[PDB]
């Protein structure tokens, strides 16, 4: 519950687009971890059916 | 290119909006057509029943 809530907090911590049912956000992440994050994005979205 | 990806998506949204509005316009058109065709069918039905009546008489 604590985690889902935190997730929800972040989801509120977003910009809701109008043209797409997609959220776009400004996110700052370390260049060092840029590959790590791109692989993480792949894993996250890969679980999802879309 | 962020602004452009956004604009391209907005264009897709615009098309979607157009596609359903046009579908609703067609619906209205199809309904009027339905009424006119119905009446045309009624006229054919009428002719057939008129013929049956005269045959019977």
From Swiss-Prot, chain A:
Belongs to the V-ATPase 116 kDa subunit family. It comes from Rattus norvegicus (Rat). V-ATPase is a heteromultimeric enzyme made up of two complexes: the ATP-hydrolytic V1 complex and the proton translocation V0 complex. The V1 complex consists of three catalytic AB heterodimers that form a heterohexamer, three peripheral stalks each consisting of EG heterodimers, one central rotor including subunits D and F, and the regulatory subunits C and H. The proton translocation complex V0 consists of the proton transport subunit a, a ring of proteolipid subunits c9c'', rotary subunit d, subunits e and f, and the accessory subunits ATP6AP1/Ac45 and ATP6AP2/PRR. Interacts with SPAAR. Coiled coil: none annotated. Subunit of the V0 complex of vacuolar(H+)-ATPase (V-ATPase), a multisubunit enzyme composed of a peripheral complex (V1) that hydrolyzes ATP and a membrane integral complex (V0) that translocates protons. V-ATPase is responsible for the acidification of various organelles, such as lysosomes, endosomes, the trans-Golgi network, and secretory granules, including synaptic vesicles. In certain cell types, can be exported to the plasma membrane, where it is involved in the acidification of the extracellular environment. Required for assembly and activity of the vacuolar ATPase. This is V-type proton ATPase 116 kDa subunit a 1. It is found in: Cytoplasmic vesicle, Clathrin-coated vesicle membrane; Cytoplasmic vesicle, Secretory vesicle, Synaptic vesicle membrane; Melanosome. Signal peptide: none annotated. It comes from the Eukaryota.
């Amino acid at each position: 519950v604590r985690k889902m809530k935190a997730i929800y907090h972040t989801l509120n911590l977003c910009n809701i687009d109008v043209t797409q049912k997609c959220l776009i956000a400004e996110v700052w992440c370390p260049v060092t971890d840029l590959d790590s994050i791109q692989f993480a994005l792949r894993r996250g979205t890969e679980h999802s059916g879309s | 290119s962020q602004s452009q990806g956004i604009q391209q998506l907005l264009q897709a949204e615009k098309r979607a909006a157009e596609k359903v509005a046009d579908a609703r316009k067609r619906k209205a058109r199809r309904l009027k057509q339905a009424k006119e065709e119905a009446q045309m069918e009624v006229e054919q039905y009428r002719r057939e029943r008129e013929q049956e009546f005269q045959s019977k008489q």
